[PDB]
Structure 1
């Protein structure tokens, strides 16, 4: 995933165009988009060399 440049973190299988339609208020939808996009832009790993010590 890092070689492709794909976002290290997991990405849910979502279609936001459907979500922006389903929900009536944009606030929860925007917040949901805030979280996942932040999640996908972060590397969820720990240097295990340090953990092993």
Structure 2
């Protein structure tokens, strides 16, 4: 995945155009989008040389 260039972190299977229609207030939807967009832009990996050491 890193070679291809896709985001390192997991990405949920969501269709935000549906979520916007579903919820009445944008605040929870915007918060969810912020959380997932921050998650997908971070590499949840540690150094398994230092960990093994």
TM-score normalised according to structure 1 size: 0.97
Deviation, 1:2, is: 0.6
Greater helix share, structure number: 1
RMSD: 0.4
Structure 2 unaligned runs (5+)? Answer: none
Task: Give per-residue Cα distances to partners, 1:4-37, cap 9 Å, x unaligned.
Answer: 1100000000000000000000000000000000
The count of residues paired between Structure 1 and Structure 2 equals: 53
Q: Hey, which bits of structure 1, 4+ residues long, moved more than 3 A?
A: none
Deviation, 1:40, is: 0.3
